[PDB]
């Protein structure tokens, strides 16, 4: 009666490897295209970067989109929050998650989930949530991690995305330095970048427990 690793929507065989592929694409566009070499310097300490060799901490496999991390029970409101109807109502069944865009730090790599009214009812309300979450509403760090720098933890994504977003409504996010096939790219500087996709990307997923 121990509670999983977390839970989370994870992604078909099929999603997966759609939203792998087209991270993989952003990194290799995004590492090539000039505006980005141009701040190089901001970007690493200490020219061509390859961002795919920079990211070298991936998923394993299929990708997902965390909600509540319980380390089996061990995390702050793993419990309350496990016992939630909707949650265990929810066990098991289908969703579609809207990737709205993908963005890259010093630090992560990773695309951003847009839940819905239903899928925010999954969301964690804990008393200890980021801080970044000031202005922003609920749900908004909801993200798929797609790589890593060699010593950041993925729990980094999440909090990368909401710096992000903060400066987004802020107005800071100047007017697109460029632009790639699926749409324009954003330099907000300190070495972040964000592509806003045209078209959102829907992904299939389950919503279930991964118990490591
Ligand atoms: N202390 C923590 N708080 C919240 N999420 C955590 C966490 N430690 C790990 N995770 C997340 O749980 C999942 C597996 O560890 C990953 O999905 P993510 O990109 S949100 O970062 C990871
Ligand atoms: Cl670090």
Redesign the pocket.
């Known amino acids: 009666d121990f509670l999983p690793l977390y839970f989370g929507w994870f992604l078909t065989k099929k999603s997966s490897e759609t939203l792998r592929k087209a991270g993989q694409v952003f990194l290799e566009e995004l590492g090539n295209h000039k505006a980005f070499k141009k701040e190089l310097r901001h970007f690493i300490s200490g020219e061509k970067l390859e961002l795919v060799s920079y990211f070298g901490k991936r998923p394993p496999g299929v990708l997902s989109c965390t909600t509540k991390f319980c380390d089996y029970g061990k995390a702050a409101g793993a419990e309350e929050y496990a016992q939630q109807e909707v949650v265990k109502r929810s066990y098991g069944k289908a969703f579609k998650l809207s990737i709205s865009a993908l963005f890259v730090t010093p630090?992560t790599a990773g695309a951003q989930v847009v839940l819905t009214d239903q899928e925010l009812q999954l969301w964690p309300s804990d008393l200890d949530k980021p801080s970044a979450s000031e202005g922003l509403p609920p749900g908004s760090r909801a993200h798929v991690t797609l790589g890593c720098?060699a010593?950041?933890q993925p729990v980094q994504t999440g909090l990368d995305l909401l710096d992000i977003l903060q400066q987004v409504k802020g107005g800071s996010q100047g007017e697109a330095v460029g632009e790639l096939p699926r749409g324009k790219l954003y330099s907000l500087g300190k070495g972040r970048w964000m592509l806003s996709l045209t078209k959102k990307m829907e992904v299939k997923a389950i919503f279930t427990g991964y118990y490591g």
């Open positions: 630090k720098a010593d950041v």
